[PDB]
Amino acid sequence: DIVAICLNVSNTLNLKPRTKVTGAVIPEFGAPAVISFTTPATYLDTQHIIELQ
Amino acid sequence: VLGNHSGGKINWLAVLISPNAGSAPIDLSQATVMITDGTHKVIAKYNSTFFNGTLKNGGSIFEAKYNNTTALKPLFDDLPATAFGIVVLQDADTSCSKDTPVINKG
Ligand SMILES: [Ca+2]
Secondary structure, eight states: OOOOOOOOOTTTSOOOTTOEEEEEEOOSSSOOEEEEEEOOSOOOTTOOSOOOO | OEEEEETTEEEEEEOOOOOOTTOOOEEGGGOOEEEEOSSOEEEEEEEEEEEEOGGGGOOOTTSOEEOOTTOOEEHHHHOOTTEEEEEOOOOSSOOEETTEEEEOOO
16 A cells, blocks of 8 residues: 655744754554655745655 | 956956756855955855846846845945855746745756
């Protein structure tokens, strides 16, 4: 299976450029998935969807 | 590199620059320029006040104006001794904006 966890971060975390984001999805049992990315140096208006990790 | 002259000196320089092939976008607001004449070594950094975008559509360099709020005034004459200004000469995709001059291929 593949499934997408959707999070709206607009007011909660302030993801401007050059910003490190760290985290995990932790299940009831078993090993966590590790989220780890640094947002790009430049965001361009021609490319509103970005691949982060 | 081009250079206006008066008196006994070259007084303004305009250094035209572009990305290398296959480069990721470069954000000039965080660049640094270093120049020396063998007697002094200045280092200069971007002051957002001195941007002219319009020239992407043609005009005269070395006579570009800039916009302090409420007025238009000549760029080169006003630019401080420790700062560099930027003038967009070709940009297809409006990637350069006054607060974030990011240059991309072309
Ligand atoms: Ca561009």
